[PDB]
């Protein structure tokens, strides 16, 4: 009997440690459900309890299902390379291979982050014709295909379109016939229009701010769209275990090792994160949307899967990971920290990429870093070295070296200083997006708005961190996580006149804008 | 020339330190405006700039105007004591004097906190007939009148009703004729229905969560309701300075010293907070509602006033206070801290009052305390002593002594321990409010709802901190700050059966409920 005593003790305390309306969790071992539990409410106002058969959007956990459809109904990604050439018909750089789309090594900038720059409302309707209009206008990459990893939902949204055109069938129908029926996922469905989903309510907020029902109206497929219950997701884990020994089986074909073009090990393959804990290899994926979070993980050597799905923005990924470590008996352990010198604090700029790192004290030998899409906590392990699980930074005087070895990324960043001039106001234009950024002063405080084919955004405050380097936080958007902070790095003439600027974030780097107004 | 160089340098950095859509600030010295500034937007979507003439709700800054009306149009508070007896016609305890209402020493429980227990929706409509129905059903106090201080909006909402009935005139008209016209407050107005106000938009949220437009539909008067611009508020500060030498002048009559019934100095009088900074006496008040914050302070010895009004939930009170200290040249200074022993952490219960203190590490010789309506940061100054600006705590083994000397409050609290039994589910009834609390289990996690004459609330999660002691956070409500955490302390028989419980928070303590169901 697989002993679930420590798992049960952890699950019993989830509602107090991961505060929110409701959720579901499961642990599958050797193809058997050994732990399955629902708690709380699907809706706090109608008082509808959360159940094991309550469907929820699984969001980015859909990506692995779109690569499974690709392999099952089309074949290897190379069969769609000709069609990708016609889809990205205005491309000016070398196009990524369809295989690079599947592995998140494409170099394309994320279209949900770009939708903010095109003026999208965070709670706006987003149609299939607008997705294609934005994806098919892309011309450039932000790194050479195969050279680095970056998470790009557009890779999978394009894949869905390629699959439907090659096959002459809908992704809705192919998933149902080729994946959900054989796996025993009885109620799983691709529901592309998020405005139609009302079987469970998702909540934005947290225990301090309060919880608010989320409204989502985007339409998506390929990068997300599947809605399924805990029991549906359990059936997928059982299908995985039943087909574990078939070398030509769909999941085994999705989940092998991958590398970058230089042979360095990569962290993602065919819609799956590839990771390890205590020396044991894991494959899985998480998903997010305003109001929702979920995660699945599978350890092939121990025939073990863990699932967590919440109708709020709490740590479902952390829950699923901790259940896996508890079931594997992995002791996750303690780092000795040192005091953070005050010389670390402030912002640091990479000239090559236009990205910025900002550091602040988070107490006890810890720093809060803002660099990627979400902030990360870093342990200060020595006078000049700090690290999170993904990023290491080393300081030498006025330079920081930042490394994210899993992305094949290494940056050299210089301390940003000086007082920022307020002559940056005016209008700027991006030729590739056909979009404008308007910057105005109101009482000495600078605000900006994004104006493009999706609409005109609200005004957002900007914050300077040194001469000509400004941050523009965007906290809510059509997809989740939101982009975080856009980094604006202005460029000037030899006369000191502004000619343009770079706008970027980790999901979409170096978007060039030229000054056209003020 | 009063030198404003340090004030201007501070004001220039407000938008970066106090992040939000917009605001206004002013400094008045010797009756002259020496600093007046607006920044940002009144509405981020319509892009309407914030101006010096943009009106906003001043919320609880209205209380001083209702006591000014009382003194000007009625006379001393003792003239309304007979009418208070008829208004609180079901009172079972000794009624407070009308003077205790004015000084916040009444012992009445706050009606906005009680509206949550009666089932109010946080964004619900609240009419004058519902205010009277809730206020006139009150029967008991939570401390003897004059013995302690507690902030109670009901004191001022009752005062408004008493004034209108004695005078036969509307508070709208009396404020306009007797206060706003003579003070030169040209556009100030009592707009009791918050749903009608649309000249400026208030925003809930913060720079990390994002900002959301607030919807408020409550109707109020006496405790709040005045809407005014920065220029209106400047005219009130100038009127104060012009009448500073008249011993029988309205503001001088509102702003003298007060004491509790035992002669100890009290911190509030006639709708004004009474405080000091660097040895200089201040009088003033702040205001809050979802989406809005403001504060005014005046230092009579230096003929100095400071005002800050924001259309978001940031630190307007901290801004107004810091401007005052900068203008007075008060050096606010540093406390040496010690490491917080782990024995402090957890929850502590006062048996007399039913209130709970919870402590957690906030880093560097600091603790986050949850006791009052909002959390407070405490400096650990010695092994067994910690303090905030308002509260001091001393630990001795399994007991903590908590003192809020400005409230005349001293509690002896014992560490709460043990595992909480889940047999608390069932229905409970408050005879005085005619309201129920329903507690249910959903998958092992307990949730509660408040059901009374205002409606049936949504379900809210509860969190146990030790045997029979639970916390129920309520983060959003009709008034602001919300109550914070309700403290539920269950009572049992000699047989171990639950008979009832105490529900309370600092604004409304010891509301007794009896078990009626499960």
From Swiss-Prot, chains A, B:
Domain of life: Bacteria
Listed InterPro entries: Bact_CellWall_Synth/Modif, Beta-lactam-related, Beta-lactam/transpept-like, D_amino_pept/lipop_sf, DAP, DAP_B_dom
Catalytic residues identified in the record: 60 (nucleophile), 63 (proton donor/acceptor)
E.C. no: 3.4.11.19
Keywords: Aminopeptidase, Hydrolase, Protease
Biological process terms in GO annotation: proteolysis
Keyword Kinase appears in the UniProt entry: no
One Pfam entry name: DAP_B
Ways its activity is controlled: Inhibited by beta-lactam compounds such as 6-aminopenicillic acid, 7-aminocephalosporanic acid, benzylpenicillin and ampicillin. Inhibited by p-chloromercuribenzoate.
Reported temperature dependence: Optimum temperature is 45 degrees Celsius.
Region (Important for specificity): 475-485
Residues binding substrate: 479
Cross-referenced SUPFAM superfamilies: beta-lactamase/transpeptidase-like, D-aminopeptidase, middle and C-terminal domains
pH-dependent activity: Optimum pH is 8.5.
Catalytic activity reported: Release of an N-terminal D-amino acid from a peptide, Xaa-|-Yaa-, in which Xaa is preferably D-Ala, D-Ser or D-Thr. D-amino acid amides and methyl esters also are hydrolyzed, as is glycine amide
Result, substituting residue 63 to N: Abolishes enzymatic activity
GO MF: aminopeptidase activity
Impact noted for substituting residue 67 to S: No effect on enzymatic activity
Subunit record text: Homodimer.
UniProt similarity note: Belongs to the peptidase S12 family.
Protein's job: Hydrolyzes N-terminal residues in D-amino acid-containing peptides.
Entries under NCBIfam families matching the protein: PRK13128.1
HAMAP family from the UniProt entry: D_aminopeptidase
Protein name (record): D-aminopeptidase
Organism: Brucella anthropi
Lineage: Bacteria, Pseudomonadati, Pseudomonadota, Alphaproteobacteria, Hyphomicrobiales
Gene: dap
